[PDB]
Design a binder for this molecule. Structure first.
Ligand SMILES: [Ca+2]
Length: 223
């Protein structure tokens, strides 16, 4: 998260860290045994870490659970990042509590102008790389599709939505990928891609979760 602020300890209890020996992506807990992330964060073996704040220090609220089923969206296109959504079934249900809680699926697609919360342990710089220890937060509005398409000519599909600032400075970045975009208590987006990080006229692009509610539920029920 570039230009964000450090989140209060455990204030985003649905945020999870995908670990493959190191933190590589983020995700959202949608129920005691399922996490939703980005298809581009796929790895054959993943350890999901819940109740995290400081990613490099044991604080007492952590719950490390291994992924049992890693399911990428069948129509994920790695070149366009279309359908960049993935589901992870944990090997066992987690203990839900204050620092480990679920986030709601969207009942509808949020209108442009809605203020959302983005969080993650991704890169904090607009140039170069700096991975933070503490969970970063960012308050950003959902942008109009016209502005999204104008920023990325011929690359924005209807399963993508831009969130952020056209003037730059604040944005999600590598490492935040798979992470949550929560507006009014509902998961509206998933960190997917973007040109650079926090650059003017290049807002972040996110997977439009409201288009996948059915697939999510169907898959959870079928697995
Ligand atoms: Ca920790």
């Amino acid at each position: 998260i570039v230009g964000g602020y450090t989140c209060q300890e455990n204030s985003v209890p649905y945020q999870v860290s995908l670990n493959s020996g190191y933190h590589f992506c983020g995700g959202s807990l949608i129920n005691d045994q399922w996490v939703v992330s980005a298809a581009h964060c796929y790895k054959s073996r993943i350890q999901v870490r819940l109740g995290e704040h400081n990613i490099n220090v044991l604080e007492g609220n952590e719950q490390f659970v291994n992924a049992a089923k890693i399911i990428k969206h069948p129509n994920f296109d790695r070149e366009t990042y279309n359908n960049d959504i993935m589901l992870i079934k944990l090997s066992s249900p987690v203990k839900l509590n204050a620092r480990v809680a679920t986030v709601a699926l969207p009942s509808s697609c949020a209108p442009a102008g809605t203020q959302c919360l983005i969080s993650g342990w991704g890169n904090t710089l607009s140039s170069g790389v700096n991975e933070p220890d503490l969970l970063q937060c960012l308050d950003a509005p959902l942008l109009p599709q016209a502005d999204c398409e104008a920023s990325y000519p011929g690359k924005i599909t209807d399963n993508m939505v831009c969130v952020g600032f056209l003037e730059g400075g604040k944005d999600s970045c590598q490492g935040d990928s798979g992470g949550p975009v929560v507006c009014n208590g509902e998961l509206q987006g998933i960190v997917s891609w973007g040109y650079g990080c926090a650059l003017p006229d290049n807002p972040g692009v996110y997977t439009k979760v409201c288009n996948y509610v059915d697939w999510i539920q169907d898959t959870i029920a079928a697995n």
